[PDB]
Amino acid sequence: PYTVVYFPVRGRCAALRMLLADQGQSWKEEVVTVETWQEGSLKASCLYGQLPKFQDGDLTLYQSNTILRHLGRTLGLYGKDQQEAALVDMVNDGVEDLRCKYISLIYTNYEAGKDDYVKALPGQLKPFETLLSQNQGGKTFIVGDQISFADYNLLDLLLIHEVLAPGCLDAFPLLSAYVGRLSARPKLKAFLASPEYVNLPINGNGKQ
C-alpha cells in the first residue's frame, strides 16, 4: 500500500526506505527520470514542487521528514511516550540540520568547501555520541529501548558521512557500534546489500 515517488538516488528517501525494509513493509518505487521531471507536469502537481512524494492508500504526502514521522507514528516507531517522542524529534531535527549542510556542500560548494566541512564534522557528530552515552550506555537506540524513525535517519546520515570522510566515526565508539549493530539487523542488512540500495548513487550530481 506504499508508493515512493523519487529520482533514481538514495538521497532523502534512503532513511524511509531502510525503515520500510527493516519493518518488513512492502512498497512500490516510482522512479522519476530527469526527462520526466523537466517535463514539468509532475513538478507542477507536487505541493511544494518537489520530491519525494509518498502515497499511503488515498493519503498523499510530501516532505521526507513528514513521511518518516507518519511511518514512525503508524508503525509505532516514535518512542514509548510523549517525553520520548520529543527526544526523537530533537534527534531527527538534528539529523535534518546536518543533512541540510551536507546537501548544501554536495550541490553548491563541494570542491572549495569540502575541506572546511570535514574539519567541522567532528563537532557536528559529537552531539549524537553524547545522546547515545546518556541512553543505556548507548547499547540500544538513539532514544529509549525501541527503534524510532530517527534511528533510520541518523543511520543513513552516518553512513553517507563515512563515504564523504572515511573514518569519521573512529573517534566515536558508541556511534560506531551503533552503526554496526543496526546495520546487522537482518532485514536491514539484506536491504543494504541489495542492488536496489547498492546500485543507486547517494546523490544526483555524481558527487559524494
Interacting residues toward ligand GSH by CB under 6 A: 11-12, 43, 49-52, 63-65, 93, 97
- Sign (positive or negative) of CA dihedral 152, 93, 167, 141: negative
98/104 Cα distance (integer angstroms): 10
The item of Fe ion, ligand GSH, a copy of itself, none sharing an interface with residue 83, based on CB under 5 to 8 Å by kind, is: a copy of itself
Give yes or no for residue 65 binding a copy of itself (CB under 8 A): yes
Site for a copy of itself in 69-88 (CB under 8 A): 69-70, 73-74, 82-83, 85-86
86/31 Cα distance (integer angstroms): 33
- Length of the chain counted residue by residue: 208
The item of a copy of itself, ligand GSH, Fe ion, none sharing an interface with residue 47, based on CB under 5 to 8 Å by kind, is: a copy of itself
Return the CA Rg of the chain.
17
Instruction: Tell me which DSSP letter residue 55 carries.
Output: E
Query: Is 55 marked within a binding site?
Result: no
69: which residues sit within 8 A by CB, 6+ positions away? 78, 92, 149
Q: Which is nearer to a copy of itself, 11 or 188 (CB)?
A: 11
Site for a copy of itself in 93-132 (CB under 8 A): 93-94, 97, 100, 123, 127, 130-131
Q: Which is nearer to ligand GSH, 18 or 51 (CB)?
A: 51
Give yes or no for residue 52 binding Fe ion (CB under 5 A): no
Alpha helix locations (H) across 23-81?
34-38, 41-45, 64-74
Q: In what order do the strands lie in the sheet with 53-56?
A: 27-31, 2-6, 53-56, 59-62
Report the residue number whose CB is nearest to ligand GSH: 50
Per-residue cell: 157 = 546520515
Q: Where does this chain bind Fe ion (CB under 5 A)?
A: 11-12
Q: Where does this chain bind a copy of itself (CB under 8 A)?
A: 47-49, 56, 59, 61-63, 65-66, 69-70, 73-74, 82-83, 85-86, 89-90, 93-94, 97, 100, 123, 127, 130-131
